[PDB]
Amino acid sequence: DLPVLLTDLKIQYTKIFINNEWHDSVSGKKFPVFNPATEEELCQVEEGDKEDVDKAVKAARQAFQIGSPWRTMDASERGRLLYKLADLIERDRLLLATMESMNGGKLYSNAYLSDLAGCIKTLRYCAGWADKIQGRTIPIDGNFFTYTRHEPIGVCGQIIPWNFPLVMLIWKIGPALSCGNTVVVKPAEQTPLTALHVASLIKEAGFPPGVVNIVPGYGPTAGAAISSHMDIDKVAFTGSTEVGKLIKEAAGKSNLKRVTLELGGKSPCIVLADADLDNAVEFAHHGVFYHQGQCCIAASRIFVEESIYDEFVRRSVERAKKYILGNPLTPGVTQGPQIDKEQYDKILDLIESGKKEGAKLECGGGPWGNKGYFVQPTVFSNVTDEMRIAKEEIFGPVQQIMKFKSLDDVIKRANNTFYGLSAGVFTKDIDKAITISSALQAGTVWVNCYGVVSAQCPFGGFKMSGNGRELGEYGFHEYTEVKTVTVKISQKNS
Amino acid sequence: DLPVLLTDLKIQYTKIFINNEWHDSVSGKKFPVFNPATEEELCQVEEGDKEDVDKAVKAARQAFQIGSPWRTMDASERGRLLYKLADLIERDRLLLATMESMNGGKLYSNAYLSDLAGCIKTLRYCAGWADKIQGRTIPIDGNFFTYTRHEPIGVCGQIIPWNFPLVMLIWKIGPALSCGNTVVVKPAEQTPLTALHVASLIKEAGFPPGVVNIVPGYGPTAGAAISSHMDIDKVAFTGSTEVGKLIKEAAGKSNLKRVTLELGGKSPCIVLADADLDNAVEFAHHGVFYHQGQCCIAASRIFVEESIYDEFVRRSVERAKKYILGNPLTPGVTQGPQIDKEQYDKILDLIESGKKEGAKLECGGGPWGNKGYFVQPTVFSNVTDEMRIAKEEIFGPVQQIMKFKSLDDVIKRANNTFYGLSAGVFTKDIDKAITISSALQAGTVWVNCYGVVSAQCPFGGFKMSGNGRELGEYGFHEYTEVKTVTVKISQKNS
Amino acid sequence: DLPVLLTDLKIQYTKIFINNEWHDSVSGKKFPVFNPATEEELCQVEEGDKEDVDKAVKAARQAFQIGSPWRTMDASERGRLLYKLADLIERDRLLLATMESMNGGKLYSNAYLSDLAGCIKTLRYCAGWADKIQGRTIPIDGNFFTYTRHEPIGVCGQIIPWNFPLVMLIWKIGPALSCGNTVVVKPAEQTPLTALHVASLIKEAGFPPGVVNIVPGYGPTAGAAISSHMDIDKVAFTGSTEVGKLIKEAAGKSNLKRVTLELGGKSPCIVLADADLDNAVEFAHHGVFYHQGQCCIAASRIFVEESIYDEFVRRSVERAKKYILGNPLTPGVTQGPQIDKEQYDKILDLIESGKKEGAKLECGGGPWGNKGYFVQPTVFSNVTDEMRIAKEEIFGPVQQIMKFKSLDDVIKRANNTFYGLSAGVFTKDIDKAITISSALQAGTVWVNCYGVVSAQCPFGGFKMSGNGRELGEYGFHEYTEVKTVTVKISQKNS
Amino acid sequence: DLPVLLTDLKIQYTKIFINNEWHDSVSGKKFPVFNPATEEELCQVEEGDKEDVDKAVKAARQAFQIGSPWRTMDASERGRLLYKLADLIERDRLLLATMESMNGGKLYSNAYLSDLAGCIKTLRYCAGWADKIQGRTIPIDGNFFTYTRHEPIGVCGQIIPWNFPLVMLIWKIGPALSCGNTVVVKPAEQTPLTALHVASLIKEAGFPPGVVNIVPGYGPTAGAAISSHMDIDKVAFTGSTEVGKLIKEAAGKSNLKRVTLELGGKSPCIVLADADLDNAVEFAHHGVFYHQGQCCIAASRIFVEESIYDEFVRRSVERAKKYILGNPLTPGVTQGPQIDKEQYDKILDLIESGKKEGAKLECGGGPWGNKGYFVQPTVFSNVTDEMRIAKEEIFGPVQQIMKFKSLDDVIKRANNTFYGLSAGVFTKDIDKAITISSALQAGTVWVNCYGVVSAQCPFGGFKMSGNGRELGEYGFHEYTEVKTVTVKISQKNS
Ligand SMILES: NC(=O)c1ccc[n+]([C@@H]2O[C@H](COP(=O)([O-])OP(=O)(O)OC[C@H]3O[C@@H](n4cnc5c(N)ncnc54)[C@H](O)[C@@H]3O)[C@@H](O)[C@H]2O)c1
Ligand SMILES: C[C@@H](Sc1nc2c(cnn2C)c(=O)n1-c1ccccc1)c1ccccn1
Ligand SMILES: [Cl-]
Ligand SMILES: [Cl-]
């Protein structure tokens, strides 16, 4: 069942959020926010820059001070607040799913059924950890009592992309807040709206002021101020490789802040001759086409064993021809637009490189419509490893299908990339599932499925797809700072 | 390569071991120890009884006192001592493998290559844990500092069987000593010799006196004194269900000591039509016949899908006809004797019940030789679920093979037992491996193998096969006692 | 603030709860439930016996079957249900706090502010663990893939006392249900009412039928049927040592079910000369007098250093003279009645033994009122270690105060008991806090406080105060059963 | 007891170590290695540069390949090899302690009794972890089986300082090798000799070729090649802040390799009026003067409460006047030289700034001797927070002592630094110990001691003292890469 908002969406929250109050930009400047489906301005939002980030950090630092409400409150109460924020997002699900769709070009049914559900479930997951973050007592050599405190780090700068605005906000703030950090969030300039609504709910839920601060604005201004800030203890980021590089450099030059990045992928699937063929086709298809291909985990290289390759290509092409393009709010629409001009241009340029480099165009290969940044769903077969479409993240509805005959060789080809976010293995054989998944240099390997993401699992890249893990037990480690306390005693006993 | 002891085995250690010294029994009585292959007495050993156990417990209690060497020494030094004991067992490997074979009726090549290697590796594993046993710091509600100490329990009584004398000694003392407990060990009356040699090495390695005490003797005397002792904090046991019951009752009536038991099994294998047939035959065969069938994990019910059942039965029978019986010290001998008369009698009685109840005798079915407790390796096909050989632990070289056609039904049949120590699943299908292994009520489930036991894995029973786990990270929990320390403070911070 | 129920309490739930429906007893018999303050019957409740327990176990077994809703649902949804049950208990807090007070003789302000808050917070804590109960992947020797499943155990019988009916219900069902077990709960015959209300909320919250079953009734009938049941996998118990012994024996003789017990204490405090005297007096006082002394953790031996002993005794006596006895529902009443005649008789008998054995009666020492099982708050000074009041759990408002001069000696005296549930240490010295707390053989040691119990901490006894731990990360281990799955692979890699 | 090498030290290992063989530099160039006590050349060593690092990385990559000996061997055997390397270092303790002293200007008794013991114990600690590095099985939403592999990362570049050459080598390679990584180590140009000896023992112990590669050489050449290498997965570093910054930038610009740094400190002690004064004086003294002040953890700001300040200053000054300078190999010598000219110059420049800025010179304040880089042990009192000696890491025998009157204020002053490696708290009060240690932004806080470092504890900086932790359970996380494997199944059960 797919309920809808029964009156038109009214945008209310357009300001910078610091110390639980709404601020105008220091400069006074505002910037437009667009609907990618119509190319029309939805509203203007206060443009945060260095001076606004500086205010947010000061508020975040003050909220983190020893003796403050956020530091002294029970861990269990930090969890209570997170479960309350999840209840409120659940309350405003229709509103939030609609705003997400409209601002982000995101199909409404997915926004409502997947993104909103993921936000709610991830917050509830992170809430449960708050009073289960524990240190150790350690049987050190000598007459000492040694324990560790897994403290919060402090002020965490969190720079967020436009492809999953709300989900990415919750992935960042959920763990950070559960561990007792304070945060300065910079949403994507394309998609600040859902973040600012959530900030209203952070106030309503009763989080102490300055625990969450939200500074909408642009990357080289507000983002760079975060990356280079002398009093931000950690920056976490999801987005491009280029910006990731800029962030680590700025961090290195400023205060050696802790950095975790999640960057692109060129995630491969390996489909063995014994694979459930329909299952492999359907998961690989959704693996590459989900949200107009605008997923870090996009299954953008699909290697299929020769004897089933032509059948795989045939079935995949027929699957890609079934989409209905248009406004992501209209029921029955199954493909929305790309987020903006820059991404639109990149996808089309890469599609053209694929034609020019001699890949076989099975379907699509051009733009669509009189308005909106729509790209036809596009399939290429006979793709080889040195083509631009085999090497570069497209972030569009563009599927690459390749044949292999040698399993040793295709593992090498799958691993022959600076990326490593994820991969997929399709086979019925137990030994092959285990050995192949172990050999792939990828952070998540799916077996006979793809794109299965849940709050209980750590998620992150190998190699230049990033560093560190998010979510799961393991992800919570990177939002703590370990302190060893060692006390001289007269005599220790076991 | 299989080296041998180049001179005859001379038995030296025959006394009770308490406070690192050799004691005569309080009574003055001694008991015979036999070689099951010849039925000849090897030596006499001091017979421990209540009074001797009482001395051992007093020594173990004194060694556990706050301020004592064993309580105050570095955890890392407890580990150092365990690695040294492993070095010494490695030094005396030939001696120990020979003594084990001679006293226990255990094939020498297995005693040397498997049992001795298992002892050495398990001690080294347990050594590594000593200074990695850690408590927690806990973010309790209110203004308090709360930590936990995972302390040793105290004096642990450890009652050991005759089928793996040395391995079972190390499985018991390794974890207990690594966690900082002191122990009172009662070896099987049939097989005290290797334990007393190891006690000599415990002295030589430099363990503080009274940390390990070894009281050879009988079950209703020395064993019952341990189970009912008012100052033994925990009893751990491997052996019969009957004795397990006696131990828990005695424990319940005395001082509510912590009890962990490992008892029989009637461990089932399920062989699917798609299984690698030779692999399944070879592992199921070794699964049931290992050490003359005298293993808790014996694969004593083998369920095979109808379409491959007759082939499975054929191949298994030909495998069982390949043994050479005789003295377990002679190279090329592949089956030694059963441990003693009682076990011999039980096996033969159960073989006769199988014939009388209408099971199909494929091979074997009687005794062998003029001397030693030898039983022919015996295979029964067309076994049904209400036969004695399907329900009762045989502890002999007696293999039961059964057909099934419905997978739902055979899972039910495999689970239809009060036992639950282990099981095996043979299939190439990923989904079947996972779903079947999850559905089996068994402590260890092997997939496309059997009898794979290593120090890194917890091991223990579901249901009446016992309680608690041994070895692995998880096993170490049951040799600690958790103490929560909660300290009032003026103000806590995260 | 202390709100109250604005209309009279109407009792609704009086039946056996099995498969989410209300059953009459098989026999047809019912038993009375009394208010200990008035000695008047509140209502009649269906009397569960063996036949009813047998129905509950069958329902619990069916709900635990592979493929059932409770086994297949997301762990996170098990958690969701527990958070919902906590929301409902919060909704009915006034009702439940009132019923608890009326049935249990429990002061209403404590019932409302402490017990109800503890139930709610503990359920929310246990909810958070559900989808964080994890196994391991293990680098076993040889070419194998080994993982562990921390499965639920199965059907858990849970036998509950009358002193904290609601808190004890939640301590039992919260962890068990979070781990995915099904339960058969037997509330105390004195106090079934709050449990049956909670069962109504279990239905309303939407727990699958047969996941929680509640069989009110008596100990030697319904309780013994649980302890001796051939298809209950684990029994957990809080209550007397005598019954604990009966449970382990019955368990041993039947199906070797896993048993965890929490039994009495004779918990000591050690007050050093440098202690904050008022702090130590106030915590030791509340430590022994809380809930009419009817707490397992009662601080029933208080050892005070000679130089501050007379001042400690003086201040404690004046503190004990400040109570107002009467109906626990009336605002300003600070001491309610004892639960029943048996406990009343025991307390008074023990008070008389203290007078006869030459302890110094400072205040109290007799009954109070024309109705209700009230005992005057009683203080004894100059108590010595062989008096009955020094050795035996009183479970009444009876405080024992003792002098010491040697710290070595008083640690010995504090440890000289078969009990070991808890202890308290009062000092300003860092080294003394650490060394004394380490040396005490007690499951929880408080430093400069007492009776600080929270859901994040494991809680349980050393020695004859019980086995196993409840709550905290550590407590969740005892509601799982570890299964090792080891899969043969062609080649493993690190 | 302090044994000595009975014949003169002969230097043997002077070459680059790659694939367990000794290589000349590609260039052919060699560089001198000096004894800081005499300023005399000990030998010439092959100078590694980019081309040699490139060879080492290729060897390390080949050793890490799926299917290789190092990837396929049992975890327990990786541990076995580490325990063997520790046995060999123990065998060559005299040799290694002597070489360390001679090359590093390190007192021989400390080199033998502390450094060598630390190497041996840390290797044995890391050995014990190898087969206890475990992933998880995770109860993910939906019908999936999800586990994690904590794999090794891959090729780890490890850049090592000159102050603890051998200890720092073992701190780096022990965890990395235990987790299954391969390494490219660059020792300090000042101190390559002990590393090259250990490489000989790595060969002798039987580590597969290319698992450990050692490239001696200079920082901007060999070091920069490591930091900027496109096929090194992680760089770990201990040294200056400046180089740390260079490493993160180079890493950022090249392949976004994982970086962990340990950098300087300006570690403060807070001494309360109630502190054991002699204990605080002795630990603070050794805290700042250990190894000629050339420790990252140097207690280089000592804040003492006014009422005991003059007594503290008096006792500290008399302690500092007791040293005997000279050759670190001569028995009775208690202070050796600084490592080299650059460090010598910095210390003397900073001493002069302290005089010029108006700090009170109590003793020392100049160079010593005709040869060697000796600095007199120097104490400054009345130091204020804006002096260079209060702000900058000296890395010399220069002690700063300061008064405070307000505890709130001195915590602020202690935390008022971009550093944060460690701190010390001296008090008898339980509450003050806990609250102060919690409030200090430092990675290790010692209470009533200082400089207590053991293998069981994580160690690392807050703020610009670095990122990540070394040693302890927690440190092992940063030498793994987590892979989530999620497998579609037909139906999951709990
Ligand atoms: N640990 C605690 O918190 C606690 C709680 C209650 C009582 N006690 C101690 O026990 C003493 C006696 O009190 P009690 O008699 O009410 O406690 P009890 O142990 O008899 O009763 C507690 C629970 O055990 C059940 N029970 C009784 N007999 C049983 C049997 N044969 N088999 C199975 N279950 C049975 C009861 O019905 C109740 O549900 C008290 O004076 C006190 O010292 C301790
Ligand atoms: C209400 C308390 S429990 C509790 N609180 C107590 C006791 C004495 N004083 N106080 C304040 C006591 O014995 N108990 C107790 C302990 C074990 C078993 C039964 C009762 C609580 C809080 C938080 C979480 C879950 N429980
Ligand atoms: Cl486990
Ligand atoms: Cl714990």
Tab-separated table of C-alpha atoms in Angstrom, chain C residues 216-300:
chain	number	residue	atom	x	y	z
C	216	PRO	CA	-0.235	-18.551	37.721
C	217	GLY	CA	-0.287	-21.148	40.492
C	218	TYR	CA	1.737	-22.728	43.292
C	219	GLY	CA	5.355	-23.803	43.608
C	220	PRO	CA	5.315	-27.587	44.274
C	221	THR	CA	2.623	-27.980	41.586
C	222	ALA	CA	3.097	-25.540	38.679
C	223	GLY	CA	6.724	-24.699	39.549
C	224	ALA	CA	7.795	-28.359	39.882
C	225	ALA	CA	6.094	-29.186	36.557
C	226	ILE	CA	8.306	-26.532	34.906
C	227	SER	CA	11.527	-27.676	36.631
C	228	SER	CA	10.846	-31.354	35.712
C	229	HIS	CA	9.402	-30.826	32.186
C	230	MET	CA	10.993	-33.036	29.463
C	231	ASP	CA	10.533	-30.339	26.757
C	232	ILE	CA	11.582	-27.131	28.551
C	233	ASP	CA	15.100	-26.262	27.413
C	234	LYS	CA	15.984	-23.878	30.256
C	235	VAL	CA	14.574	-22.856	33.638
C	236	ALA	CA	15.509	-19.475	35.189
C	237	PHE	CA	14.604	-18.735	38.794
C	238	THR	CA	14.754	-16.106	41.510
C	239	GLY	CA	13.826	-17.055	45.090
C	240	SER	CA	14.918	-19.227	48.030
C	241	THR	CA	18.008	-21.455	48.231
C	242	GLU	CA	15.798	-24.440	49.135
C	243	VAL	CA	13.716	-24.144	45.940
C	244	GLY	CA	16.837	-23.440	43.879
C	245	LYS	CA	18.150	-26.816	45.086
C	246	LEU	CA	14.812	-28.502	44.229
C	247	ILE	CA	14.901	-26.946	40.718
C	248	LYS	CA	18.460	-28.143	39.865
C	249	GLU	CA	17.670	-31.666	41.113
C	250	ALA	CA	14.411	-31.882	39.122
C	251	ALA	CA	16.234	-30.466	36.089
C	252	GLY	CA	19.067	-32.991	36.566
C	253	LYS	CA	16.687	-35.961	36.854
C	254	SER	CA	14.457	-34.938	33.919
C	255	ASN	CA	16.175	-33.579	30.763
C	256	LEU	CA	19.346	-31.824	31.978
C	257	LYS	CA	17.787	-28.474	31.094
C	258	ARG	CA	20.005	-25.394	31.490
C	259	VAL	CA	19.426	-23.806	34.925
C	260	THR	CA	20.250	-20.287	36.119
C	261	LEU	CA	19.398	-19.280	39.704
C	262	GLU	CA	19.417	-16.074	41.759
C	263	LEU	CA	19.030	-16.892	45.416
C	264	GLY	CA	19.495	-15.063	48.722
C	265	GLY	CA	22.302	-12.969	50.013
C	266	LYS	CA	23.840	-11.961	53.256
C	267	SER	CA	25.454	-8.992	51.624
C	268	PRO	CA	28.132	-7.165	53.676
C	269	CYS	CA	29.221	-3.527	53.724
C	270	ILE	CA	32.689	-2.447	54.890
C	271	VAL	CA	32.850	1.135	56.168
C	272	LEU	CA	36.382	2.517	56.575
C	273	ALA	CA	37.311	5.259	59.067
C	274	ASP	CA	37.926	7.692	56.180
C	275	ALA	CA	34.420	7.140	54.683
C	276	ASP	CA	31.968	9.951	54.107
C	277	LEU	CA	30.000	8.984	57.210
C	278	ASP	CA	26.575	10.452	56.383
C	279	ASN	CA	26.769	9.028	52.844
C	280	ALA	CA	27.697	5.584	54.228
C	281	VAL	CA	24.944	5.704	56.876
C	282	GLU	CA	22.235	6.724	54.332
C	283	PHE	CA	23.203	4.143	51.661
C	284	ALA	CA	23.692	1.309	54.167
C	285	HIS	CA	20.317	2.170	55.718
C	286	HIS	CA	18.441	2.162	52.386
C	287	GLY	CA	20.609	-0.865	51.482
C	288	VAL	CA	19.020	-2.960	54.247
C	289	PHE	CA	15.539	-1.378	54.688
C	290	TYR	CA	14.434	-1.021	51.020
C	291	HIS	CA	10.980	-2.595	50.381
C	292	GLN	CA	10.645	-3.778	54.000
C	293	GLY	CA	14.027	-5.566	53.694
C	294	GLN	CA	12.599	-7.890	51.040
C	295	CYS	CA	15.485	-7.496	48.572
C	296	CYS	CA	17.980	-10.189	47.602
C	297	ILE	CA	20.744	-7.569	47.856
C	298	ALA	CA	19.850	-6.464	51.438
C	299	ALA	CA	22.951	-5.000	53.149
C	300	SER	CA	22.377	-7.290	56.111
